[PDB]
Amino acid sequence: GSHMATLKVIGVGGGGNNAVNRMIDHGMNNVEFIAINTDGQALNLSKAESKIQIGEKLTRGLGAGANPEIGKKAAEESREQIEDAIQGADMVFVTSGMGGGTGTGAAPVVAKIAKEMGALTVGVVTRPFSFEGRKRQTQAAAGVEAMKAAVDTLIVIPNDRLLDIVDKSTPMMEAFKEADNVLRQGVQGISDLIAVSGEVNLDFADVKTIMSNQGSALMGIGVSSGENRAVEAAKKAISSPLLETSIVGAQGVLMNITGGESLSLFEAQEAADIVQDAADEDVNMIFGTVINPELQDEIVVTVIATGF
Numbered sequence: 001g002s003h004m005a006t007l008k009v010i011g012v013g014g015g016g017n018n019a020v021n022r023m024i025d026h027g028m029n030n031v032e033f034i035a036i037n038t039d040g041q042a043l044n045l046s047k048a049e050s051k052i053q054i055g056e057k058l059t060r061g062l063g064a065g066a067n068p069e070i071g072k073k074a075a076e077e078s079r080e081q082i083e084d085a086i087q088g089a090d091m092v093f094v095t096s097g098m099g100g101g102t103g104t105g106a107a108p109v110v111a112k113i114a115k116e117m118g119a120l121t122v123g124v125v126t127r128p129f130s131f132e133g134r135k136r137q138t139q140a141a142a143g144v145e146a147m148k149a150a151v152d153t154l155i156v157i158p159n160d161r162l163l164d165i166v167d168k169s170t171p172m173m174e175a176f177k178e179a180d181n182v183l184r185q186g187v188q189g190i191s192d193l194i195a196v197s198g199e200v201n202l203d204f205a206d207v208k209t210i211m212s213n214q215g216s217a218l219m220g221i222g223v224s225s226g227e228n229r230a231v232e233a234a235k236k237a238i239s240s241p242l243l244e245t246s247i248v249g250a251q252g253v254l255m256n257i258t259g260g261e262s263l264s265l266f267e268a269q270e271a272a273d274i275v276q277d278a279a280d281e282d283v284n285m286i287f288g289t290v291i292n293p294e295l296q297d298e299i300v301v302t303v304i305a306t307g308f
């Protein structure tokens with residue numbers, strides 16, 4: 001029979017659950033969301049179908065007060081509830097803001113549980129703005145390292161990079177949605193990859209081969225049309241200004257190209273060469289293609305890059 005991969009997204013702490021709420025608002029089908037927090041007031045406002053309040057004995061329903069040991073102990077003491085919410089997932093994305101008490105301490109525990117439950121486990125986490133100061137940055141760094149030890153693959157977004165994509169008036173929430181896009185489009189690209197049978201078919205086992213026990217990762221999508229569409233879509237897929245880990249140095253890549261019946265062999269090679277050239281390495285590519293005739297002149301390039 002056919003395989004039906006279960007994808008879950010888990011928000012851990014305030015920033016993580018913020019990202020979950022905004023992704024739910026944007027709309028996202030066939031993904032299950034789990035909200036995990038110490039802060040009962042925030043959790044009450046979560047849109048997630050599955051909510052886990054952790055650490056109530058430790059915090060009396062408050063946040064962790066910037067103490068990552070409390071976040072860690074809260075998650076460990078709710079291990080069974082976390083296991084029960086995860087059970088059945090083939091893939092888990094853990095999103096969290098590093099530098100506070102709950103995200104920094106609980107997110108690596110959640111990631112460890114997911115991996116021990118058999119899920120392919122991806123972290124997507126932020127580092128604090130420099131204006132939040134050195135102690136927050138240093139706590140966040142310890143969280144990042146703990147995440148790296150617990151996940152299969154880790155995507156880090158330094159919040160300082162948001163200062164590169166705003167003008168003096170861009171609302172903070174609009175900036176936050178740009179960071180959200182990294183996780184949302186990564187999840188959606190995998191979901192679409194699994195849902196469709198491709199002319200050159202990639203599936204969840206190929207995702208596992210590229211992401212399992214790899215470390216840093218890049219996940220990107222590019223869309224373009226018209227002249228030079230394949231090159232432009234490929235460049236967009238690999239060129240986010242928000243990432244700590246760029247494409248440079250990638251040694252493994254999963255690339256899927258979707259287009260209409262006009263999709264040419266020549267432009268598929270162009271797109272693949274863009275990614276190889278940018279990595280500046282001998283890349284082990286897993287290459288796929290999907291013909292969607294509903295598409296007209298549009299091409300979509302999806303990239304997952306690892307092996308750094």
Ligand SMILES: Nc1nc2c(ncn2[C@@H]2O[C@H](COP(=O)(O)OP(=O)(O)O)[C@@H](O)[C@H]2O)c(=O)[nH]1
Binds near residue numbers: 018100127128159176
């Ligand atoms: N990009 C982004 N960063 C956030 C958001 N919320 C919080 N942060 C960042 O995440 C860090 C931890 O905040 P938070 O998740 O509320 O802390 P915790 O719940 O106590 O673990 C902060 O220091 C900020 O750098 C958000 O919605 N988007």
Ligand SMILES: [K+]
Binds near residue numbers: 194203
């Ligand atoms: K497929």
